[PDB]
Write a protein that binds this ligand. Structure first.
Ligand code: HEM
Ligand code: HEM
Ligand SMILES: C[C@H](O)[C@H](O)[C@H]1CNc2nc(N)[nH]c(=O)c2N1
Ligand SMILES: C[C@H](O)[C@H](O)[C@H]1CNc2nc(N)[nH]c(=O)c2N1
Ligand SMILES: CNCC#Cc1cc(C)cc(N)n1
Ligand SMILES: CNCC#Cc1cc(C)cc(N)n1
Ligand SMILES: [Zn+2]
Lengths: 412, 412
């Protein structure tokens, strides 16, 4: 019940007790493990006070006033307000705590050593999509900080009945457009083709190129969403060059500096924040491995092998591997020379081992998803490959949610 | 109950029903996933006939005589023999079926497309360690086949009381010695230092070098084990050279061509074969990534970076990654030019996707351990990264077992 995890590179063993406080279900059973399944699987008052109480007991245990009068009266207060409204409202201090701990609990995030340095932007007074555009722009400008990136989250009003939802329809605040072609191939980013089409359906006029930043599709209070274009001066981009290969520029590649996930759901004390865009800084491999070399993404291993002069007829020449390293040396090199914050997969995985140590020490554990923590290249030469990890679901949490254009009781 | 697994590169979905026949427990619960834990965790007659019956019902269902008289009388026969002896003996046909399906069921093995082409060597008449040495030598010579490697397993007598166990004490039939140093560092293979010491404790005279093949430590019928040296003409080795870098030879590296795991336990119909050495052929990354570049193994990334002239002061120069690719191009190149069978991680992972397809088609599923199937470099540019997999325990199976020098009621 009080399980051990080993590192098979350093022989370090650590004991996990945190998993006892785990609440939600993982998808695994005693007879089947779903640890590699990507997405395994309205609320009433009777369900809502337990979740409220559990969250408040840990918040007040955190500020070292567990059981004081201020705790007891807040308990009473929220119970009464859930009696009164069949929902409730978080204190500002509770929102910041809940948001910081949703990140802390995010078992798929290798970056969590930073979890206590999160800037929280309270957007619960927002009422319109223009208001959301304005809040989001302020978030982008703050988090970018001239390339000295800063972690931030903006939190729009919580779900009420369920038909009044605030939603950012984009999967990230800043993504490149995806257009198919007459010849069937694809320009830009194939991941976003169905989303790019929706933007044009709502009247986006597309500069049908490669690295065309997409417009925001913001839905406020369950209303049909509206398009807004981020001031291009606010979208910071890094041109990608190699520190040896001068033909690299002719590839004409760039990426955006701000990774900002906008499609997930923030759960705190039982309340559900359906729009909660959050940003940090990139680990290089997200760009250089997945974005650039996934077969169903930009898929550029072809032309980097070509302009490197490689044995491309033989699978066993490892020409794919060798081009993959050069691409990631360049992504890193270009961000660094521009003073735009980026972390390499060696530094980031070392920090997560160090973070894990602190979590077992002063928290009794750290939920971690090995399938997602291990980088998507050079896995075993980073220390997280050799680190056993336990995955379990703690709350506050970030959860997946359906794409809104499948939920929306649209009125057009 | 009848679960689906998706490939997020090709959008292919396949339905798993095989997991229903799963029997053993995984280590996961509804509230915690142990999919990254390496080793999660005598027999009576009452337990033994169910296992015997379950195995026989699938064997006879396999040869398309489910429920015939030959099935019914074999059922009766084995029941009577477990009444008589409180154990039983497999038919030759049943041993070959059981061994081929233990491999088929091995969820951590990416090579299983070959599972039906296994040569089974029945060594259940063996009574002495010399006999084991002789059986093992015949296995090594057959499986090597002049570099045209052939899959094989040799099966020594099954466990009886438990104090009469046949055991190969080495973890692989062919491993390099591991000696520490006065200055604390290590020559050879640090993985094997405690085993190499045991060999010297039993009187092995060590050529204290790097690539010194270790002697066999064979235990027969629960007796104290004995040392035997494999005729060096039978240990095929590949000298590792690079197809571009001529300084590669000066590194003076070689590896053995035959991967042959000797420390696991083969379970069939409830019977336990504690010595069952089995061999195939290498996937390059086992040598070039893990054996050579694991920090606690040969750990040669240092000198390959050095003789490549690389930016070794900066973690973010990806000098480790870039040296790692060249090492694996060389491992492959050297094996191929010597006509010694080897598979690259791209070909082997493609074949396992194809194998998975056949298993869902004609078997209803394929148990697979993602954490182990994904190669330890370049993970996401191989198709198994993007393939969801279900892990569950089917029998016949290969299981881990304690190291014998911790179990053995030694009489010296
Ligand atoms: C500060 C620097 C950060 C770094 C270096 C980092 C690193 C990463 C990486 C590499 C991933 C994997 C993404 C993928 O493979 O698609 C990830 C996922 C994730 N991160 Fe972090 N992150 C950072 C900040 C944050 C912040 C500020 C939050 C929330 C407030 C967060 C929460 C998450 C979540 C929930 C996921 C999973 C998203 C998904 O399932 O697609 N991270 N992070
Ligand atoms: C024919 C070519 C084969 C290839 C290319 C292959 C490939 C692999 C690889 C890469 C591993 C991972 C080893 C590690 O990372 O330590 C593995 C493990 C394994 N293989 Fe296969 N294999 C082959 C044949 C076989 C055979 C003949 C058997 C049994 C009869 C087998 C059963 C297993 C088992 C049980 C494991 C897990 C061992 C462990 O947990 O350390 N394989 N295989
Ligand atoms: C902690 C982790 O489970 C451990 O390092 C595993 C990960 N995956 C692996 N996969 C393979 N094929 N071989 C290994 O030794 C390991 N090691
Ligand atoms: C099938 C598999 O779960 C899927 O491809 C996962 C594997 N691990 C991952 N890990 C990260 N960080 N990001 C991903 O998109 C994925 N994809
Ligand atoms: C599909 N998830 C995409 C992503 C992402 C991500 C998000 C954050 C906050 C940081 C980071 N380094 N990456
Ligand atoms: C720790 N397991 C080591 C191993 C191994 C192995 C075994 C077989 C049969 C084939 C292969 N390609 N590799
Ligand atoms: Zn699991």
């Amino acid at each position: 019940r009080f399980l051990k995890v080993k590192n098979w590179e350093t022989d370090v063993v650590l004991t996990d007790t945190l998993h006892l406080k785990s609440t939600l279900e993982t998808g695994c059973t005693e007879h089947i493990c779903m640890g590699s399944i990507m997405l395994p699987s309205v609320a009433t008052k009777d369900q809502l006070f337990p979740l409220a109480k559990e969250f408040l007991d840990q918040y007040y245990s955190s500020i070292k006033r567990f059981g004081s009068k201020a705790h007891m009266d807040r308990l009473e207060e929220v119970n009464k307000e859930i009696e009164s409204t069949s929902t409730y409202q978080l204190k500002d201090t509770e929102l910041i705590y809940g948001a910081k701990h949703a990140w802390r609990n995010a078992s798929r995030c290798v970056g969590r050593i930073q979890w206590s340095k999160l800037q929280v932007f309270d957007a619960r007074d927002c009422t319109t999509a223009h208001g959301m555009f304005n809040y989001i722009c302020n978030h982008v400008k703050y988090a970018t900080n001239k390339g000295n990136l800063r972690s931030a989250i903006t939190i729009f009003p919580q779900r009420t009945d369920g038909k009044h939802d605030f939603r950012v329809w984009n999967s990230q605040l800043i993504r490149y457009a995806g257009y198919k072609q007459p010849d069937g191939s694809t320009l830009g980013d194939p991941a976003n083709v169905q989303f790019t089409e929706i933007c044009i359906q709502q009247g986006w006029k597309a500069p049908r190129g490669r690295f065309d930043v997409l417009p925001l599709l913001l839905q406020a209070n369950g209303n049909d969403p509206e398009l807004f274009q981020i001031p291009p001066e606010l979208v910071l981009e890094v041109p990608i060059r190699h520190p040896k290969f001068d033909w690299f520029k002719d590839l004409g590649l760039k990426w955006y500096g701000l990774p900002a996930v906008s499609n997930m759901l923030l759960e705190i004390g039982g309340l559900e924040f359906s729009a909660c865009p959050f940003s940090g800084w990139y680990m290089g491999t997200e760009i250089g491995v997945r974005d650039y070399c996934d077969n169903s993404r930009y898929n550029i291993l072809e032309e980097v092998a070509k302009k490197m002069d490689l044995d491309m007829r033989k699978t066993s020449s490892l020409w794919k591997d060798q081009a993959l390293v050069e691409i990631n040396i360049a992504v890193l090199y270009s961000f660094q020379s521009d003073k735009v914050t980026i972390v390499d997969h060696h530094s980031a995985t070392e920090s997560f081992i160090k973070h894990m140590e602190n979590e077992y020490r002063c928290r009794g554990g750290c939920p971690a998803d090995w399938v997602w923590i291990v980088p998507p290249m050079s896995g075993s030469i980073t220390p997280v490959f050799h680190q056993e990890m336990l995955n379990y679901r703690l709350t506050p949490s970030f959860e997946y949610q359906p794409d809104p254009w499948n939920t929306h009781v649209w009125k057009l």
